[PDB]
Amino acid sequence: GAMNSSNYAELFNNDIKLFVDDTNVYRVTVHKTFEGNVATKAINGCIFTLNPKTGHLFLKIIHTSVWAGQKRLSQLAKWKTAEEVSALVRSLPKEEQPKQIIVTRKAMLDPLEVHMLDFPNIAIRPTELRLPFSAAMSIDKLSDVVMKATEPQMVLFNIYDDWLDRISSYTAFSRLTLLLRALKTNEESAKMILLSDPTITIKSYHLWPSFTDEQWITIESQMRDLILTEYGRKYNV
Amino acid sequence: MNTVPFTSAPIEVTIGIDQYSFNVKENQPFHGIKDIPIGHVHVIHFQHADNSSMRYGYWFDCRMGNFYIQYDPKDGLYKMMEERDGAKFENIVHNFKERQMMVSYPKIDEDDTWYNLTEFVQMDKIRKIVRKDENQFSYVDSSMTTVQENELSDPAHSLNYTVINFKSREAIRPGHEMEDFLDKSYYLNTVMLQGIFKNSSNYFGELQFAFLNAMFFGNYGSSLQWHAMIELICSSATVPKHMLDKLDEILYYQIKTLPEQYSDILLNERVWNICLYSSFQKNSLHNTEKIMENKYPELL
Numbered sequence A: 001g002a003m004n005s006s007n008y009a010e011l012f013n014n015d016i017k018l019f020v021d022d023t024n025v026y027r028v029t030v031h032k033t034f035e036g037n038v039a040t041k042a043i044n045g046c047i048f049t050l051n052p053k054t055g056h057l058f059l060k061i062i063h064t065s066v067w068a069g070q071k072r073l074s075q076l077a078k079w080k081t082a083e084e085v086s087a088l089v090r091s092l093p094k095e096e097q098p099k100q101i102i103v104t105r106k107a108m109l110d111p112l113e114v115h116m117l118d119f120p121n122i123a124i125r126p127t128e129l130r131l132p133f134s135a136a137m138s139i140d141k142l143s144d145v146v147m148k149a150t151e152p153q154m155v156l157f158n159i160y161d162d163w164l165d166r167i168s169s170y171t172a173f174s175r176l177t178l179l180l181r182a183l184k185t186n187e188e189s190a191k192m193i194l195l196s197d198p199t200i201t202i203k204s205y206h207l208w209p210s211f212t213d214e215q216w217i218t219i220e221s222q223m224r225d226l227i228l229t230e231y232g233r234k235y236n237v
Numbered sequence B: 001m002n003t004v005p006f007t008s009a010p011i012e013v014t015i016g017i018d019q020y021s022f023n024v025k026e027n028q029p030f031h032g033i034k035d036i037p038i039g040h041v042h043v044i045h046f047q048h049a050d051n052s053s054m055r056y057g058y059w060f061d062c063r064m065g066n067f068y069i070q071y072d073p074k075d076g077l078y079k080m081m082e083e084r085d086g087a088k089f090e091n092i093v094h095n096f097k098e099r100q101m102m103v104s105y106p107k108i109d110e111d112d113t114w115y116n117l118t119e120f121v122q123m124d125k126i127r128k129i130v131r132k133d134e135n136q137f138s139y140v141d142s143s144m145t146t147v148q149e150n151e152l153s154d155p156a157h158s159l160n161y162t163v164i165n166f167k168s169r170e171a172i173r174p175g176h177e178m179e180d181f182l183d184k185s186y187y188l189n190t191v192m193l194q195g196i197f198k199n200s201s202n203y204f205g206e207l208q209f210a211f212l213n214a215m216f217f218g219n220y221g222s223s224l225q226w227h228a229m230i231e232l233i234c235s236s237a238t239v240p241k242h243m244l245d246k247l248d249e250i251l252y253y254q255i256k257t258l259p260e261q262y263s264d265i266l267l268n269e270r271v272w273n274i275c276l277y278s279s280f281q282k283n284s285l286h287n288t289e290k291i292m293e294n295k296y297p298e299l300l
Ligand SMILES: CC(C)COC(=O)C[C@@H]1C=CS(=O)(=O)C1
Pocket: A055, A056, A057, A058, A156, A157, A158, A159
C-alpha cells in the first residue's frame, strides 16, 4: 500500500523500485498580455524517475512542443508522465524492470495504473512521505540540460555521484533528501553552502561537489541548520 | 391473470410479490397469490420472522409454466416448483379460489410502477445471469456473490452479471489510455453495447434486474453492478439520445420506489454526485436529478 515512515527501509532492499515525481513536468511563467489579461508561457520540464537503491536518475525531458494545441495541460501532464514511465519500463530488459513504482503525488495513481495495465505484477503505490524531488531543478546540471533541450530527450545521471563507494543507499538517500529539502526551503543559501569553498569542485561527470567524508558531515550540519533556521524565519520561533 | 398457489404456510414469514408485501402467521390458512398480471416478469420473495437473515426469492413468468410454492422442512425454506400436470393445477387453484384462501395481486389501475421497473427485464436473460437450467424460474438471495466479486466462491450459486471494470484492458484501448479513461464512450458503445449486450434494451434489462435484486434482497454485488452500469453511461460523452432519455425514466422510477429508510445503504454517494453534477451527462437526467434532490438531498 502506501509508503511511509514505518516501511522506510523497503526502499533499500533488493526488489527493483522507482520513485516517479511529476512536479516539474508542466512548468509555466504567468505574465500579462498587451490587453492586460493574464496568460501562461510553458517552459521545458522533466519527469524525475529515480531508483533509490542505485541512484539511477531517468530524467525524461519534456519539451514545450508536447503542449502545442493541447487543452487542460495540468491534466494532460499526468497522463504524459504515465505514458513516458510506461515507455521507459517497456524499454528496460525484463530483469531490470521495477517490481514497484512509487508516485510522489496521488493524482498520478490512476494515470500510471491505466498505462501499466500490461504489467499487472508491477505495483503502483502512493507515499505519505513529503519528498523534496521538486527541487531537482535546483541542481544546476539538471536544470541546464532541461532548459537547453530543443526536442524530447532522455538523459541518464546517477544522483548519488560516487557516494555508494563509501556509504550505504539508506545514507545516500538521506543525504540526497536533506540536500534537496534545503534547496527547496532556501535555494540561495543552500547553494552558498555547497559552493562557498572554491577548492572543492564538482567533477565533470558528477552533480555535487567532491566532499571528503568529514566535509560532508560539515555540509550536512549546515543544511540542517538552514532548514531549522528557515523554519524559524517562517513561523517566527 | 395467473396464480402462484402455496401448499401451506408452516412458518411465519413476510411474503413479497413485486413491490408489495404481507405478513403470514405460522400455520395461517394461506394458499397463495392470484390475479398476477400477465406480460411481466415477477418476483416472489420471503423473509422469515424468526431469522431476518437471508431474504430470498424467485423470479418467474407465468407464461412459461404453472409454478407453486411448498415449504421444505429439511432445507428450511419456501421453494418454488413447476407442476407439470395442467389439470391437477387448474382443479386445486380453482378449489382454493373458491375457498378465498388467496391474496390478490393488489395493482392499482393507474399504476405503472412495476412495468416501469421491469420494462426491459426478460426471463430469458435472467436465466443467463442466474444459471440453473433445469428450472424455468430463478432463485436469488441476499448472500449470492457475483462473478466479478469472486475474481477479487461456489460458481454454481453466482450472479453472472456482465463484468465492468474501468481499469481493465477491455475498457482501455492501447494508445487511447487517457482518452478512453476520461470518456468511456468506446467501452460503452463498442465493447458493451455492440459487442456484449447487442442492444441497449438488453443493457437496460440487466441494469434493472441488478437494481431489483439490490432492493429486494439487499444483494450487495447487485448494487455494485447497478451503479457500475449507471456510471458507464454517465461517464461517456457520446450516448444515443434515446438511451439518455430512457435512462432518466428508468432511474426516476427506481429512486421513486426505493424505501426512504434504505437510501443510506442502497445509494453510492460518489457515483450519484459524479453522475448528476460532474459527468458528461450531468445535464441529461432531469427527472432523476429532480427526484433525487427532493427525496435525498442529504446524499448530495
Ligand atoms: C535507459 C537504459 C539504457 C538503462 O540505463 C541505465 O539504467 C543507466 C543508469 C541510469 C542512470 S545512471 O545512474 O546514469 C546509470
